[PDB]
Structures are given as C-alpha cells and as structure tokens.
Design a binder for this molecule. Structure first.
Ligand SMILES: CC(C)(COP(=O)(O)OP(=O)(O)OC[C@H]1O[C@@H](n2cnc3c(N)ncnc32)[C@H](O)[C@@H]1OP(=O)(O)O)[C@@H](O)C(=O)NCCC(=O)NCCS
Ligand SMILES: CCc1cccc(CC)c1NC(=O)NC(=N)NC
Ligand SMILES: [Mg+2]
Ligand SMILES: [Mg+2]
Ligand SMILES: [Mg+2]
Length: 221
C-alpha cells in the first residue's frame, strides 16, 4: 500500500485505487448521498468500504460512518480515524482511541498546484524554506498542501475548531534514501482540546509514489 509508507494491534488501514462495481452504502449512509452526482457517490461508498475493512482488523463490526456538523466522520465507539479521496485513490486509517488519540491523512495527485493556490495554502517561510529541505523537481507545493490537510483532519476531532492554512507552520525533512520523509506541524493559535493536553506540534510523514502524494499524522494516546 501507499499509506503504509506514512504510518508508524492499535492501528489499521485499507486503500483502493478505483471504485469496485456493485458496492453499496449502508442504509444509514444512503441519505447522505441520495441526491449526489455519481463521482461523489462512488468515492463516498468506496472510502467507507475501506474504512470498514480497516475497522474490521481492529475487531469492530461493520458500521455506518456518518458525518458531523463540519463534515467530520463519525467513528464507532472507542475508535478514531481519517478518510481521504482524490483522483485514483481512496484511503482510510483507523486507530484504537486508548492508544491513538487522533489520525489525519490526505492524498493528492503529485502535480504542481494550480496557479494561485500556493499563496492561499502556505506561509511565507514555508514558500522560502521548504524547497531546500525537499528532493528536487518533486512538487513540494502539493506536498505542503497535503500536510496542511492531514494536519486539519487530525486537529479538528480534538478541538472542534477551525484551523486555517496560516495557523500552522509545517517544516519538512527528507529520509536518507528515497521520496519520503517527516514533517512537523506547529500550531500557531491556541491548541486547547476537548480533553487531554493542548496541541502544539503534530508530527507526520509524507511520501510520493505512483503519482500520488500521501501524508499522515498519528497522535499517540
Ligand atoms: O482529502 P479529502 O478532502 O478527500 O477528505 C475528505 C474527507 O475528510 C473527512 N473530513 C471532512 N471534514 C472534516 C473535518 N472537519 N475534520 C476531519 N475530517 C474531515 C471526511 O471524512 C471527508 O470524506 P467524506 O465526505 O466522504 O466523509
Ligand atoms: C478550501 C479548503 C477545504 C474545502 C473543503 C473541504 C476541506 C477538507 C476539510 C478543505 N480543507 C481545509 O479546510 N483545510 C484546512 N483548513 N487546512 C489547514
Ligand atoms: Mg476527496
Ligand atoms: Mg484532501
Ligand atoms: Mg497523475
């Protein structure tokens, strides 16, 4: 799998690169996409099948994954997780909450960002400093965006607050060999959480492989 390259039972994952035919949502999930276009129905159904495959590894029976007020997934009791879909990818990573406080993941096509998007998703020091810490000709701008998305998805279940692109400073390193490495997201705003200690730094991993960027953050419980 692609997502295993960005991950450290208590944790499980599943991914697919297409939408297998004949997949259906659970009855509780069907209303959420009753009037949705085909592409949305397909990604929604496939990513939730991945989530149920991953949850099954952790001993959890198949259950619907509904969405909260800010779109966040609703996990079975005692579980945490994250979902992502982009062209050519559906993925789910789930964790046992006693050992895993939060998960955030993201996948994007490994392409340059469209013109204008970089300025909307980055901080000035990231634009200045990140290219030197990253392997050449890789789309560091797209990787930064993915790191911002994994950061928000790991952040939101714990704070239930907005995190803007300007609210976290992300610094990168590259592993000795290959197209992978670590990143650290430092929250610049108050990181108070619903329970437990406040969020300050979130450590994650990034990977470029098979035309996709993957990022993931797994916060220890
Ligand atoms: O990367 P993507 O934007 O495709 O991820 C989308 C997923 O992020 C998740 N998500 C959406 N809003 C979120 C939030 N505020 N916090 C955490 N995860 C969120 C959802 O599970 C969404 O997929 P769904 O709409 O099929 O459930
Ligand atoms: C315009 C951004 C967007 C639109 C729709 C859905 C999502 C996913 C939650 C996002 N991304 C974020 O809001 N990212 C984020 N705040 N990163 C720090
Ligand atoms: Mg998507
Ligand atoms: Mg995304
Ligand atoms: Mg491509």
């Amino acid at each position: 799998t692609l997502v295993a390259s960005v991950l450290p039972e208590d944790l499980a994952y599943a991914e697919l690169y297409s939408d297998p035919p004949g997949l259906t949502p659970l009855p509780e999930e069907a209303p959420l996409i009753a009037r949705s276009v085909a592409k949305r129905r397909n990604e929604f159904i496939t990513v939730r099948h991945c989530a149920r495959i991953a949850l099954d590894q952790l001993g959890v029976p198949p259950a619907p994954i509904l969405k909260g007020d800010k779109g966040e997934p609703c996990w079975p009791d005692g579980m945490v997780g994250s979902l992502t879909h982009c062209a050519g990818y559906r993925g789910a990573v789930v964790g046992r909450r006693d050992a895993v406080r939060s998960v955030g993941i993201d996948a994007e096509p490994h392409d340059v960002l469209p013109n204008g998007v970089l300025d909307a998703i980055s901080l000035p020091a990231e634009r200045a400093d990140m290219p030197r810490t990253m392997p050449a000709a890789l789309h560091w701008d797209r990787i930064l965006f993915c790191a911002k998305e994994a950061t928000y998805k790991a952040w939101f279940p714990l704070t239930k607050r907005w995190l803007g692109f300007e609210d976290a400073h992300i610094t990168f390193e590259t592993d000795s060999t290959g197209w992978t490495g670590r990143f650290v997201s430092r929250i610049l705003i108050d990181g108070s959480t619903l329970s437990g200690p406040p969020l300050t730094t979130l450590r994650g991993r990034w990977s470029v492989e098979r035309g996709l960027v993957l990022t993931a953050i797994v916060l220890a419980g």
